[PDB]
Amino acid sequence: GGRMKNQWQHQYFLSYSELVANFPSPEKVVSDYIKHKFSTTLPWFGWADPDNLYFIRFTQSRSNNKSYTGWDHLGKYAIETLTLTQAAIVNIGSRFDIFDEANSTAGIYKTNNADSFDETNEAKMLPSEYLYFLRDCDFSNLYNKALSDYWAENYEKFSTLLQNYYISSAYYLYKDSAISKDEYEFSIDAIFNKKNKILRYYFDVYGYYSSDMFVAMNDNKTMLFIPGATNPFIFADNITDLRDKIKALISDKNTRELFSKHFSLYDRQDGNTYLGVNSMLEQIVSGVVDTNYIMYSNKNIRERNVFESMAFSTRERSFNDGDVIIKSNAEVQRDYALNVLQTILSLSPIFDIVLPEVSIPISLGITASSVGISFDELINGDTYEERRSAIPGLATNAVLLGISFAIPFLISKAEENKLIINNLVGSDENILNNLGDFLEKYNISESDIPENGSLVINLKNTNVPVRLVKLNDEEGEIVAIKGSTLSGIYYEVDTETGYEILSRRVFRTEYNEKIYWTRGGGLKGGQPFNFEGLDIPVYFIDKPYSELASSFVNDDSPLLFPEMDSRLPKPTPELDIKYYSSNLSSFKEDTVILMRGTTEEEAWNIANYKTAGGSNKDLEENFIEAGPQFNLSFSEYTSSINSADTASRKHFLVIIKVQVKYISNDNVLYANHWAIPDEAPVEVLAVVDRRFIFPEPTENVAEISSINFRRLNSGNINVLKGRGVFSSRRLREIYLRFDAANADELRPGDVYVKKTKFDSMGYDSHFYNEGIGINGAPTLNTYTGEYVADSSSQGATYWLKYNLTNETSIIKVSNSARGANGIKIALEEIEENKPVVITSGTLTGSTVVFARKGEYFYAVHTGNSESLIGFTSTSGVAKAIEVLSSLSELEVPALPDVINNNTLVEYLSDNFDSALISYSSSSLKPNSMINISRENVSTFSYYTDDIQLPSFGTSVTILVRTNDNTVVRSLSESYTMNSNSSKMVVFNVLQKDF
Ligand SMILES: [Cl-]
């Protein structure tokens, strides 16, 4: 579009500018809020511009009967001048015990400098009115929501930018021989730690975890990543050498302050009991504190991509720091307010940028040192003294140097820069029209792009690795993508440079023994971090406002505010938790319910290992809390619904039950937060996916469930039609007693049989499978229809909300680990008003058989869960025939050498009245294909190679009693993913009566 050839560096600097320009300025946020409120106050104040009216305090007062306050003053005796907005930020109300007194020692005026302040230049507003008005505003929660929206809109931008800062900084420093080849390869190997050769830790001092640094370490090398430094990679032979280097660095007072900037403002101040980061650094330098308090906790980082970890911890720090900055800013440093921009601005490129009239960070007073960036020039340099002198309030409230000067200035310059760059390079270019040229350019062809897979190229321009894939949702359209910091997420890239285009996301799903690449979103159940099988009592996908019946925002939800969702347990009140922990001898074994916002991978580790920090390791020696301890790292949970809402937005919410003996707030300087050792055992009560992955454009449940039951009692199979799959791993006895059989290659001899009712108390070892998930699941179970589907059902949608009431009985019949299960039902034994529903679950290649012989109905499910190839089309058929012959009182008949699905059709036609077979055929597995047909056998292939998008099958039967006659109806169907919305829709059905 523009004159210049767009380049990777240019697009990087544009993203950097965008991150800084989008950042919420405290001054602007508060001013907009105050104008909004002023438009509806009483007295009405929509005339008052709070950035151009001045709260001025004086030490000399003189009575004036015509001025609005009743007093006039002389500028000579002005002690504090602020705009109304500044006066709101610095909590001016704290200067006055009775607000009504501020009317005599202060005034609101239309100008900030004048010989005499009086009725000639006053504003018609009392200082007391404004103080009362301020008391009714919570500015901390306002800036918290502003930061929440900022992160909702820029979290991926920040993550990708940070990753590219790391990669580009490493390459550039290696080409300048500032790091050896080994060091460059080490740094790159540490991003994903693919071969598991490296150990990655948060950088801590006395258990205080840095917000944006980390350590990568193996026997060969130790590395500290410290963003913003002139060389972000500090290498050492071992941890002792690294400690010595760090102590030497921070032995200079200024270097030490800059280093401490990598920790939250809370972690830097001393607590009631334990010292903070600043004291600990000072005393390490003086030598009173051993250097082994550097890297003392050794908290492991659990996310695959280290930049996910760094981004999440930077976001958390920004919430904490905004809190402090708005609430208490009296007698602080001038660069205080800049903490919330510390890390983002640390992503200035080390490779220097040249573009006409673009402001480079060092021309903005932002220098760099060996331990990170510095604002000393911007804040105190004589270059900017003129601009600062112009601004009111900076004289008496140091924090305003950041709030009124520095942040607005940097934001305006970043807006300038992004306009300049857009005018200089135009717009984007990706695989369009352009496939032929690109493919001839990299000596490739369509066949080279693996059908089911990807192809890695290196772009001739920047030598950026890129990945070609054929999109399954858009009929094979080829695209070029690159992996994000989030698992299963990719971004299309610029074909010339390789820079990621965060607008265009591609999702990598694994399902049906295939790899799908889709644009709209993934299949819940095929992502790398599948929750469905962790025995979590409550797991669901949170719906944003725009996906609900009721304001149409798509990056937030009312899951927790105003009314916490009824599905979720309510947390223990802070007062109860503090009472319990303070009387520890009495409530040591009692439990509280706590919340936390986490990444997908932290949530998965917590739900998997059932520990506070998702730690694999063991914990106790009759553990006893005692504050920080060498090599003991902590997770942090919360009791505030507001905090959990803000932290889990666009990520995951976790709710746990934990014993009081593991929790501690002794060294927590803010409210409603509790530390728990990472290895501490917990009970995971709930996990909510609040990522809001959706494309861009209760009486009801009881009544509906009753209607479903009334339809089922009538014999209308249509009540199970179109509503998705349903299963459940919950065991409840049902009234029906039936013959059950199991045939598994785990038991090569004999077919196990069971003729006792499935009792609630106990599973049956033969109708179980220790390999399904966290601790196995039942392959045959019975329950009642008050919960038709639970968290274990992959792809359930309708039966997660509605049901068929407690008067329906569900028989879930799955396949054995390497074999078949089966049930035989006496048809005369079903009773009116007690209908029976048989469900097969989510079909991914298994085979289901419904059949009738006399007054008996047989249902058999064969397959394997060990990902075996060839088993289900042959050996599974053998197990199914063994089960069918056992249940039908039959010695196995003649069977050929090649037993395949065709001989299943033949055997069912021979030894049964009528039958339905629902199976998964593929021309690449010839045994699975059915080329024969028999009248009394109906066939339904719920999967084929034709199906482009992810899919699954279902097969169900209803047994209903009416007029001393038992009606039996079976319905098989196959669902396929709707390309445009990533939701399952019915694709095929076959219905057969019995
Ligand atoms: Cl990639």
Side-chain angles (χ1 to χ4, degrees), residues 1-75 77-194 196 198-427 429-439 442-443 445-459 461-469 471-495 497-512 514-551 553-562 564-617 619-620 623-702 704-746 748-756 758-760 762-823 825-851 853-854 856-865 867-890 892-963 965-994:
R3 292 138 46 195
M4 299 180 63
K5 194 223 301 185
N6 213 348
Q7 302 205 126
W8 198 90
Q9 288 83 1
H10 299 159
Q11 279 161 323
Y12 179 102
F13 199 74
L14 177 57
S15 284
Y16 177 58
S17 310
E18 278 166 341
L19 276 176
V20 174
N22 289 342
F23 201 81
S25 178
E27 174 166 84
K28 166 74 166 177
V29 173
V30 176
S31 164
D32 287 342
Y33 183 68
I34 288 172
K35 284 173 185 172
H36 186 74
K37 277 280 267 278
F38 276 3
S39 75
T40 64
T41 52
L42 258 179
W44 168 79
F45 281 112
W47 56 265
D49 186 5
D51 298 311
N52 290 280
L53 303 178
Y54 301 85
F55 195 114
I56 318 189
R57 304 169 52 210
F58 307 86
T59 52
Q60 165 272 317
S61 180
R62 158 171 147 195
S63 173
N64 185 328
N65 290 72
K66 279 162 283 179
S67 80
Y68 194 64
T69 59
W71 311 85
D72 54 29
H73 319 264
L74 288 176
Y77 299 90
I79 268 52
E80 192 177 6
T81 289
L82 304 167
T83 71
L84 295 196
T85 302
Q86 293 175 326
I89 284 167
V90 299
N91 303 281
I92 187 65
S94 75
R95 271 73 145 182
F96 305 105
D97 307 60
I98 313 92
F99 291 169
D100 261 306
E101 179 148 30
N103 294 325
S104 63
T105 58
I108 309 303
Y109 300 97
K110 308 221 281 201
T111 185
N112 66 285
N113 64 90
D115 43 356
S116 171
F117 296 93
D118 63 56
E119 70 272 10
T120 189
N121 49 22
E122 76 189 356
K124 294 293 179 295
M125 194 181 84
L126 297 169
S128 70
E129 287 178 335
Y130 190 64
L131 298 178
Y132 283 112
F133 166 81
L134 292 179
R135 189 204 279 161
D136 184 69
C137 297
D138 192 348
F139 300 107
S140 192
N141 203 242
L142 181 76
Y143 198 68
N144 179 265
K145 194 76 208 319
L147 287 169
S148 179
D149 288 355
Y150 172 83
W151 285 110
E153 286 137 31
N154 295 278
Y155 179 77
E156 281 165 84
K157 212 187 218 82
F158 180 88
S159 303
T160 308
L161 189 70
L162 176 71
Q163 175 171 252
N164 284 334
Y165 167 78
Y166 189 97
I167 296 167
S168 72
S169 296
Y171 178 82
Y172 175 92
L173 252 35
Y174 169 64
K175 305 302 281 189
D176 276 1
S177 191
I179 53 174
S180 64
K181 188 218 186 195
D182 304 352
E183 286 173 335
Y184 174 80
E185 286 177 345
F186 185 96
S187 64
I188 298 308
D189 189 18
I191 291 181
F192 277 103
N193 191 32
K194 302 77 159 165
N196 260 16
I198 300 167
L199 293 172
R200 303 130 100 206
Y201 304 95
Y202 296 92
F203 180 76
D204 80 85
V205 174
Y206 195 25
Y208 298 109
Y209 309 109
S210 164
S211 95
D212 62 0
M213 303 191 289
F214 79 84
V215 167
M217 173 193 300
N218 65 22
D219 40 312
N220 171 24
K221 219 153 288 197
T222 291
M223 186 198 80
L224 171 63
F225 172 69
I226 171 171
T230 65
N231 186 341
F233 308 93
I234 293 166
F235 281 96
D237 289 316
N238 56 79
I239 198 173
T240 306
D241 179 22
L242 178 66
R243 282 158 173 166
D244 290 332
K245 282 161 168 277
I246 288 176
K247 178 179 174 173
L249 278 175
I250 65 176
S251 287
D252 187 297
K253 173 171 182 166
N254 215 252
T255 307
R256 189 169 60 244
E257 206 199 79
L258 292 180
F259 190 71
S260 75
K261 262 56 189 300
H262 291 279
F263 300 81
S264 80
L265 292 164
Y266 282 130
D267 284 1
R268 269 181 266 171
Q269 54 186 243
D270 293 344
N272 276 344
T273 319
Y274 304 103
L275 304 179
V277 169
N278 286 329
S279 291
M280 288 299 285
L281 297 179
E282 291 175 41
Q283 298 309 313
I284 285 165
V285 176
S286 65
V288 171
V289 163
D290 296 315
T291 60
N292 64 4
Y293 276 91
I294 294 161
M295 294 304 307
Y296 166 88
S297 213
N298 304 109
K299 181 176 176 76
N300 287 294
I301 135 170
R302 302 292 177 178
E303 292 86 13
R304 256 123 192 86
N305 180 294
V306 68
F307 307 118
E308 181 61 19
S309 308
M310 291 305 89
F312 200 74
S313 62
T314 284
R315 173 185 178 269
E316 176 164 324
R317 167 174 168 180
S318 88
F319 296 136
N320 297 352
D321 281 1
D323 214 58
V324 176
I325 293 160
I326 304 301
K327 275 170 187 176
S328 51
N329 37 65
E331 199 154 313
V332 302
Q333 310 204 324
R334 321 219 294 174
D335 66 296
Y336 206 65
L338 290 167
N339 277 267
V340 284
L341 277 165
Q342 162 76 14
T343 297
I344 293 161
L345 287 168
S346 276
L347 307 189
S348 149
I350 59 172
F351 61 80
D352 244 348
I353 182 215
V354 287
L355 288 176
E357 300 300 342
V358 155
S359 301
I360 187 176
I362 180 143
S363 70
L364 300 170
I366 295 176
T367 76
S369 71
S370 44
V371 290
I373 67 173
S374 168
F375 309 92
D376 181 66
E377 276 298 319
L378 180 53
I379 291 296
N380 303 315
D382 301 327
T383 297
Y384 290 109
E385 185 48 282
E386 191 166 20
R387 287 146 159 101
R388 298 191 298 268
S389 57
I391 303 171
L394 314 189
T396 54
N397 292 266
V399 68
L400 294 178
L401 264 305
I403 274 165
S404 288
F405 166 57
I407 295 169
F409 178 68
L410 296 172
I411 290 168
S412 53
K413 303 296 278 186
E415 271 287 320
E416 284 186 350
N417 279 0
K418 90 170 181 182
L419 288 198
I420 289 175
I421 299 160
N422 284 326
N423 189 263
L424 291 194
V425 308
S427 294
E429 78 200 35
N430 46 273
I431 275 187
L432 203 52
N433 281 113
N434 293 58
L435 208 186
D437 315 323
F438 183 79
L439 230 58
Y442 286 88
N443 301 31
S445 51
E446 269 65 25
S447 65
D448 299 329
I449 290 171
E451 202 60 80
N452 185 86
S454 66
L455 173 60
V456 171
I457 333 170
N458 275 85
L459 278 43
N461 314 43
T462 316
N463 199 40
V464 163
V466 167
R467 169 171 286 97
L468 294 179
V469 303
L471 290 174
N472 301 46
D473 62 357
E474 287 161 357
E475 317 324 310
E477 180 192 354
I478 299 181
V479 291
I481 65 188
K482 214 186 188 314
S484 76
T485 59
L486 304 169
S487 85
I489 301 191
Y490 296 75
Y491 307 116
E492 304 187 45
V493 305
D494 194 292
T495 44
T497 59
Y499 198 82
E500 300 91 327
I501 312 299
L502 304 179
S503 320
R504 305 173 157 277
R505 298 157 79 180
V506 182
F507 299 85
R508 187 189 176 284
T509 305
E510 267 180 38
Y511 211 82
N512 276 322
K514 287 182 66 179
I515 300 170
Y516 299 93
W517 307 84
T518 52
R519 267 203 165 94
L523 178 74
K524 306 317 175 203
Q527 75 271 39
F529 290 89
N530 175 69
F531 285 88
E532 264 80 353
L534 299 169
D535 281 326
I536 302 170
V538 181
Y539 165 73
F540 57 88
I541 310 302
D542 198 19
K543 293 172 177 175
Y545 288 95
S546 57
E547 295 283 0
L548 298 169
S550 311
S551 54
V553 293
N554 62 2
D555 59 355
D556 213 349
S557 83
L559 178 69
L560 302 178
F561 170 89
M564 186 163 172
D565 192 325
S566 59
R567 293 178 287 181
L568 299 166
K570 290 176 192 304
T572 307
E574 182 66 11
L575 281 179
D576 296 6
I577 303 178
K578 187 53 173 281
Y579 188 82
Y580 293 150
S581 62
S582 289
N583 304 118
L584 183 47
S585 52
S586 318
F587 308 100
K588 185 187 74 183
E589 305 293 71
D590 293 15
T591 63
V592 294
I593 295 174
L594 288 169
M595 302 169 291
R596 179 186 180 192
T598 66
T599 63
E600 181 186 26
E601 311 191 44
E602 262 287 297
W604 195 91
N605 282 346
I606 297 171
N608 192 75
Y609 300 102
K610 299 165 153 184
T611 48
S615 180
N616 177 20
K617 304 154 153 200
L619 173 43
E620 68 147 14
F623 170 77
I624 298 171
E625 196 273 353
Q629 296 286 337
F630 288 86
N631 213 49
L632 179 62
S633 49
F634 292 84
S635 292
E636 184 162 88
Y637 289 74
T638 182
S639 58
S640 168
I641 300 182
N642 178 226
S643 273
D645 190 335
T646 296
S648 62
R649 184 191 183 183
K650 285 275 284 169
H651 295 86
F652 281 71
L653 169 68
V654 169
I655 304 178
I656 58 152
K657 214 194 198 72
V658 57
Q659 295 188 281
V660 166
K661 53 173 152 192
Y662 303 119
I663 73 182
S664 180
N665 74 349
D666 292 1
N667 203 41
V668 182
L669 271 49
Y670 44 101
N672 302 318
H673 280 72
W674 297 86
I676 312 183
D678 284 332
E679 297 66 27
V682 305
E683 185 184 346
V684 179
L685 299 177
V687 179
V688 182
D689 184 333
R690 303 192 69 197
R691 287 184 298 177
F692 307 141
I693 293 169
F694 304 100
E696 296 168 344
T698 52
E699 308 197 19
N700 186 256
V701 64
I704 290 290
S705 307
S706 298
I707 294 175
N708 287 332
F709 177 92
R710 299 209 307 278
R711 296 179 68 205
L712 176 62
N713 249 8
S714 307
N716 265 120
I717 190 64
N718 290 307
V719 70
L720 304 189
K721 188 178 300 185
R723 314 195 173 184
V725 65
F726 61 100
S727 68
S728 181
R729 293 168 183 174
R730 156 167 164 165
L731 261 167
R732 291 297 192 285
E733 177 163 301
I734 48 174
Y735 83 103
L736 190 65
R737 189 226 60 84
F738 43 95
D739 296 330
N742 175 262
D744 190 330
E745 288 198 348
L746 196 77
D750 219 323
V751 302
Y752 174 82
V753 176
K754 170 178 168 70
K755 284 140 179 175
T756 69
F758 269 83
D759 62 76
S760 316
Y763 66 147
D764 188 316
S765 164
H766 301 245
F767 299 119
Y768 201 79
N769 183 335
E770 299 283 356
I772 298 173
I774 186 175
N775 282 119
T779 174
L780 197 177
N781 60 285
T782 51
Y783 52 105
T784 40
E786 60 270 341
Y787 305 110
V788 184
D790 72 358
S791 170
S792 71
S793 190
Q794 281 189 30
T797 59
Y798 181 94
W799 299 114
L800 294 172
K801 177 165 183 169
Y802 305 101
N803 58 76
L804 314 104
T805 77
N806 65 17
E807 280 229 298
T808 29
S809 32
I810 312 299
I811 319 178
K812 185 222 161 37
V813 189
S814 179
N815 65 263
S816 211
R818 286 178 303 174
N821 293 293
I823 61 174
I825 301 264
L827 286 182
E828 292 292 71
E829 206 164 272
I830 295 142
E831 306 172 13
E832 298 196 27
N833 315 341
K834 297 174 172 185
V836 190
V837 173
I838 297 164
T839 188
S840 316
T842 309
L843 304 185
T844 307
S846 33
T847 295
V848 175
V849 179
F850 295 119
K853 174 122 86 173
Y856 292 90
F857 182 78
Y858 306 77
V860 190
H861 194 172
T862 188
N864 83 92
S865 55
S867 297
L868 300 168
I869 202 70
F871 182 93
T872 304
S873 359
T874 65
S875 303
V877 175
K879 298 294 180 183
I881 292 174
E882 289 173 355
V883 169
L884 289 167
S885 298
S886 183
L887 274 321
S888 60
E889 298 294 314
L890 199 72
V892 300
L895 288 178
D897 293 338
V898 162
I899 296 173
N900 48 12
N901 289 342
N902 298 276
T903 68
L904 181 63
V905 167
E906 302 183 60
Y907 167 90
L908 286 166
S909 182
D910 291 353
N911 298 271
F912 283 94
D913 306 6
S914 188
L916 172 72
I917 311 175
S918 295
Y919 65 112
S920 171
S921 58
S922 167
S923 61
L924 305 188
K925 314 186 210 184
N927 279 327
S928 72
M929 300 277 295
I930 296 177
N931 39 275
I932 69 179
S933 53
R934 298 279 194 272
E935 173 167 13
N936 57 333
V937 182
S938 296
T939 43
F940 179 73
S941 58
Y942 67 74
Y943 174 88
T944 57
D945 303 323
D946 133 71
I947 307 188
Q948 280 287 110
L949 287 171
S951 66
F952 59 75
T954 74
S955 205
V956 307
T957 303
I958 67 176
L959 319 163
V960 193
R961 187 67 154 169
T962 40
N963 311 308
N965 178 18
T966 306
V967 180
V968 175
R969 313 187 66 191
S970 292
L971 169 71
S972 291
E973 43 181 12
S974 60
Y975 295 71
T976 194
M977 169 153 287
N978 168 267
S979 71
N980 278 301
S981 82
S982 180
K983 301 205 176 208
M984 303 306 302
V985 291
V986 63
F987 175 70
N988 239 336
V989 306
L990 181 67
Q991 198 279 134
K992 182 154 181 165
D993 285 325
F994 291 109

